[PDB]
């Protein structure tokens, strides 16, 4: 039979059968209970709208993501999300399909063990396998080397790989991602008068960020230009009218990636943690990693980031090496495409964690040889 | 490739008239008189399928040879029968590899085209020497005058 390549993510759940080009169903991972009282009788009001249904009734819900930073903080809601994904968005019972979840690097063990225990006890799948979210993104590019920066919505991690041999001592995981950029944008919009507070209006700020923000090639020059002319002010129409005008908030929101001091984080930007991740590698594979830097994940879709990052790394790196940044147009679904490719391989067909194996060793089987 | 051409050449004028009337009814009101890559992509979006513009360009380049971006009558039928891929899996790799290895009766790693001639005599389909010539041109990618194993994989790749 065919395998189910699910990809929990944090912000958008992407799923679909193995062997295709794009995920079959992509929908936000939010579960929102209603918060008001409700007076109409017999309206058929449910107790929790999940997935894309709660992005249409969000006016009277309190949306809450079940995955904070890679890790899962609310297991009941995550179980509800998985149940919805299997039964309503794909309509395939899990009793007859292997599953291939994905997990960020350096995550707590208990999260992974609980994930496998749920998949084997509640949904009762035949066999499931957990894979690191960066190796798949490297599969999708058709490479076999390279250092991949997978800046998702929950957590940004940077896994270097050479000739198929991952370097476990050079993984640099940073917890700044799309959600913190949304919060920072929502916080700097208040400097013009627009106040978004409700958890429903966070979605509106996210839409503003997606449609308007861009990464500046040079920060100081843009700050000077936006403060003199008015060629940058782009307007946007809220879900009820009252258009708003975003000035130099456009390139200040995604600039937080390269200067995490804006949101008070100490660490260095995504332009310098990649160079540090390279320098921890051996001295003889640094040229190949320099030449095959891969971008993935949703947050790396800002217009103009593949040039800013290349300029920064070229500034840091030695002058002789060639710096090349691979930015495929299908960046958002790169991890899932790689997952489909991996699940479609014949050599991989014996790496699944078969159910009888789980019955013999318990949920701690995932840390064992079947990784 | 020309697989859909083969499939529809097996078919007859019934499919021709069928797809002609289907164009008449569904493409009613159009200004182009054919089906365009963007046209079919928007149609897929309207029905509920989600193709990508890059895929649209790829498929139209595959179906359109003259560069028009639309479909000739034969090309239109080929594209119409193309969207569904009923036949897949293209025979078996290992068995055909064995067949090809024994095809080199001299076992020199090279295929004598006289062996191809005898095998075709066994096939016996109405064919001229230029037809097998064109077939080899399709297969003999490096033009070495024989059938390379990798090129044997290539020309039989996915062949049912």
């Amino acid at each position: 039979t065919t395998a189910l390549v699910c990809d929990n993510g944090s912000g958008l759940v992407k799923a679909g059968f193995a062997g295709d080009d794009a995920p079959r169903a992509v929908f936000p991972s939010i579960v929102g209970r209603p918060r008001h009282q409700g007076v109409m009788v017999g309206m058929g009001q449910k107790d929790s709208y999940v997935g894309d249904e709660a992005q249409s009734k969000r006016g009277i819900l309190t949306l809450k993501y079940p995955i904070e930073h890679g890790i899962i903080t609310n297991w009941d809601d995550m179980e509800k999300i998985w149940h919805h994904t299997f039964y309503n968005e794909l309509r395939v019972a899990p009793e007859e399909h292997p599953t291939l979840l994905t997990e960020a690097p350096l995550n707590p063990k208990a999260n992974r063990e609980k994930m496998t225990q749920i998949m084997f006890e509640t949904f009762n799948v035949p066999a499931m396998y957990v894979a690191i979210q960066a190796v798949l993104s490297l599969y999708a590019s058709g490479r076999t080397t390279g250092i991949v920066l997978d800046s998702g919505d929950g957590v940004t991690h940077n896994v270097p790989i050479y000739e198929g041999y991952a370097l476990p001592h050079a993984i640099m995981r940073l917890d700044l991602a799309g959600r913190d950029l949304t919060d920072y944008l929502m916080k700097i919009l208040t400097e013009r008068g627009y106040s978004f507070v409700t958890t429903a209006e966070r979605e509106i700020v996210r839409d503003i960020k997606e449609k308007l923000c861009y990464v500046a090639l040079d920060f100081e020059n843009e700050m000077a230009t936006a403060a003199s002319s008015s060629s940058l002010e782009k307007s946007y129409e809220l879900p009820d009218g009252q258009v708003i005008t975003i000035g130099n908030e456009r390139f200040r929101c995604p600039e937080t990636l390269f200067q995490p001091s804006f949101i008070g984080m100490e660490s260095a930007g995504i332009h310098e943690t990649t160079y540090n991740s390279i320098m921890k590698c051996d001295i003889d594979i640094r040229k190949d990693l320099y030449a095959n830097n891969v971008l993935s994940g949703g947050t790396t879709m800002y217009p103009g980031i593949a040039d800013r990052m290349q300029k920064e790394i070229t500034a840091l790196a030695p002058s002789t090496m060639k710096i090349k940044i691979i930015a495929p147009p299908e960046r958002k679904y790169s991890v899932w495409i790689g997952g489909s490719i991996l699940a479609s391989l014949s050599t991989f067909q014996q790496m699944w964690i078969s159910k009888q194996e789980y019955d013999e060793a318990g949920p701690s089987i995932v840390h064992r040889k079947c990784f | 490739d020309d697989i859909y051409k083969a499939a529809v050449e097996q078919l007859t004028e019934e499919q021709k008239n069928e797809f002609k009337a289907a164009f008449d009814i569904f493409v009613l009101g159009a200004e182009d008189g054919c089906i365009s890559t963007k046209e079919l992509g928007k149609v897929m979006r309207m029905l509920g399928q989600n193709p990508t513009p890059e895929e649209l360009q790829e498929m139209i380049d595959e179906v359109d040879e003259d560069g028009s971006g639309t479909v000739d009558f034969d090309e239109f039928l080929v594209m119409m029968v193309r969207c569904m891929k009923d036949d897949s899996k293209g025979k078996s790799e290992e068995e055909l590899s064995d067949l090809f290895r024994m095809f080199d009766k001299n076992a020199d790693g090279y295929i004598d085209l006289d062996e191809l001639k005898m095998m075709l005599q066994a096939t016996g389909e109405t064919i001229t020497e230029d037809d097998i010539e064109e077939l080899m041109k399709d297969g003999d990618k490096n033009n070495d005058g024989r059938i390379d194993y990798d090129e044997f994989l290539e020309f039989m790749k996915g062949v049912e």
């Binding site: 295709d20 079959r24 599969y139 490719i341 | 029905l47 509920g48 569904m84 891929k85």
Partner: peptide
Amino acid sequence: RPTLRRVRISADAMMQALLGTRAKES
């Protein structure tokens, strides 16, 4: 690396999604 396509669902379903009410013969 091979590729598998499933978005190209069976052409009958595509024709139905295209036509709807007028999906009587095609």
